Design a protein around this ligand. Structure first.
Ligand SMILES: CN(C)c1cccc(-c2cccc(C(=O)O)c2)c1
Ligand SMILES: [Cl-]
Length: 242
């Protein structure tokens, strides 16, 4: 079932922003959002695509494990953290596009398409360049579709090995303390309008898990920190986290 709570719209308008948060209570099998329509509108996944891309690369042996070093190609880019060696953990942490573009080239069009259909991932459409379709190609996914995919990953139900799913969930680790654990991935889509930011993942508690997927308009990079800040304000309001 699904419930629309427009009171959360305050968390966006108070920041001169527009967007959607979608929450899913796993124990109760109930969903909540501020905007049912936008919750089902499909956007470019941008760097949230690093979740399925990592899974596929691991399961096919393109990536051996989370310690394998992907050497910097020596081309200076404008994101300083990209101009260095990475492993799967740090490439996810710093959303290192050029590492994941090489993953996609080694995966190839045929295997990438087959695996995204097996995952039931978004519109399953990889039209465009194999090394950039999640940034400016035909693939699209909604917030509710992100949750559907993440629930499968959490339960090790995706059609890749258990090992691959465990490794990616390790690489998604974002925050942990005595009260909760967050495993998640950010995204920032600029090449096609509307420019948006994403944050998708889940909050692990002692006796429940809350899945979340949010996106918001992102006219400039100045607002990127609002992706996590708005989401955590909703979690606090619903007393999911202190
Ligand atoms: C010119 N581009 C590629 C650009 C510009 C501004 C910021 C980023 C960026 C880099 C790393 C992570 C993230 C994020 O998702 O927080 C965003 C990228
Ligand atoms: Cl972990």
């Amino acid at each position: 079932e699904w419930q629309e709570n427009k009171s959360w719209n305050a968390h966006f308008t108070e920041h001169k922003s527009q967007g959607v948060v979608v929450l899913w209570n796993e124990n109760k099998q109930q969903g909540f959002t501020n905007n049912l329509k936008r919750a089902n509108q499909a956007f470019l996944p941008a760097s949230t695509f690093k979740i399925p891309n990592s899974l596929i690369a691991l399961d096919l042996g393109v990536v051996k494990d989370e310690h394998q070093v992907f050497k910097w190609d020596g081309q200076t880019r404008d994101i300083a953290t990209w101009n260095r060696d990475h492993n799967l953990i740090t490439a996810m942490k710093y959303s290192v596009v050029p590492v994941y573009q090489e993953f996609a080239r080694q995966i190839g069009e045929a295997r990438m398409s087959k695996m995204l259909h097996a995952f039931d991932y978004g519109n399953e459409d990889i039209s465009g360049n194999v090394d950039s379709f999640w940034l400016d190609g035909g693939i699209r996914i909604s917030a509710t579709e992100q949750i559907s995919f993440l629930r499968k990953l959490y339960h090790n139900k995706l059609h890749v090995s258990e090992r691959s799913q465990r490794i990616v969930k390790q690489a998604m680790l974002t925050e942990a303390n005595g009260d909760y654990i967050i495993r998640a991935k950010t995204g920032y889509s600029t090449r096609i309008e509307p420019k948006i930011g994403w944050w998708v993942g889940w909050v692990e508690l002692d006796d429940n898990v809350w899945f979340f997927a949010m996106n918001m308009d992102m006219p400039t990079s100045d607002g990127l920190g609002l992706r996590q800040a708005i989401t955590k304000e909703v979690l606090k309001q619903e007393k999911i986290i202190p």
